[PDB]
Amino acid sequence: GPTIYHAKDAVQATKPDMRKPRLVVFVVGETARADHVSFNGYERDTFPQLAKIDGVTNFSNVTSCGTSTAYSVPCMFSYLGADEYDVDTAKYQENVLDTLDRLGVSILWRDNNSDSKGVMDKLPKAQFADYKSATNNAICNTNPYNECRDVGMLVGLDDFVAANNGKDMLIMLHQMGNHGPAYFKRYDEKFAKFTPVCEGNELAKCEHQSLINAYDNALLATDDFIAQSIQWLQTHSNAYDVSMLYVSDHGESLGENGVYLHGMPNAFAPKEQRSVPAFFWTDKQTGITPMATDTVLTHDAITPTLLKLFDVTADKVKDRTAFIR
Ligand SMILES: [Zn+2]
């Protein structure tokens, strides 16, 4: 089909041959609720590793585009904004990855969730890698489900950096994260802090506290994955300006008014399905300044954030609020 462009005017103001190349990891999260984040007031410390890392910003007021992976993920990378976004014709629209690629940024998408929901479809197939099986993911045999773990996506990223030495790079890591209903399968035993847990798919038959426990354990694993992503970036901070962005695709209902899981239409969806966490980290030397933690933000902020991270300006999102200055 056709491509309708939105950033043909886009210009990268400076190039990696004149200033430090930039290296960004964007963790595309899954099913995480803002109100179960310690930083947002949650009673449990669900992000203990992130709490110890300097330079992390937590955003307390972020609303997802929609309530499902298929709806939210393409919107996260869209130029159109939630008001004009259409899930069925996103495939015909230039998205922010298309732009950054055109401007010379090396794009990599590793996926331990499903796939990019069409976002990577215009780009060469080799730039997308499936990390849901043991063919690519070296960390799948740590649990009785043989489920591949998000941290497996970090393995061998030095190879990608070496292959693209001196270039700007954007790496998407699409998490399995807190995907349900089987929250108990989403984390290895070392993250089983809150017990007992719900261990079946009939969620309404579990004790509510056990359901919450499994969900919170899954967040601990995500805290770990993000912390290790930051550590990996840190090892490249001499040669690259390094940053990490995390946003979840949507939240999750956990029994409130008897509603479970997600995917409800936006018109009727409860707040829990759209209130998501977002984190930003950057190294001391990058000169990137986060917006105020309580800025009213949505998934619409992702595209101008990614453009700003690579010194690109596009008229379409000129004045649009981002996660960063
Ligand atoms: Zn999802």
Numbering used by the authors: 217 to 541
What does the paper say about this structure?
MCR-1 confers resistance by modifying the colistin target, catalyzing transfer of phosphoethanolamine (PEA) onto the glucosamine saccharide of lipid A in the bacterial outer membrane. Bacterial lipooligosaccharide PEA-transferases such as MCR-1 are organised into two domains: an N-terminal inner membrane-bound domain predicted to contain 5 transmembrane α-helices and a soluble, periplasmic domain containing the putative catalytic centre.
To facilitate such studies, we engineered MCR-1 to lack the five transmembrane helices, generating a construct containing residues 219–541 (MCR1ΔTM) which was purified and crystallised. Phases calculated from datasets collected at or near the zinc X-ray absorption edge ultimately yielded structures for two different crystal forms in the space groups P41212 (1.75 Å resolution) and P21 (1.55 Å resolution). This apparent autophosphorylation was confirmed by mass spectrometry of MCR1ΔTM crystallisation samples, which showed a mixed population of proteins with a mass difference (78 Da) consistent with the presence of phosphorylated and non-phosphorylated forms. Moreover, both comparisons with previous structures, and our observation of phosphorylation in one of our two structures, clearly identify Thr285 as the likely nucleophile and PEA acceptor in the catalytic mechanism. For the mono-zinc mechanism, a model containing Glu246, Thr285, Asp465 and His466, with both Glu246 and Asp465 deprotonated, provided the best agreement with the experimental crystal structure.
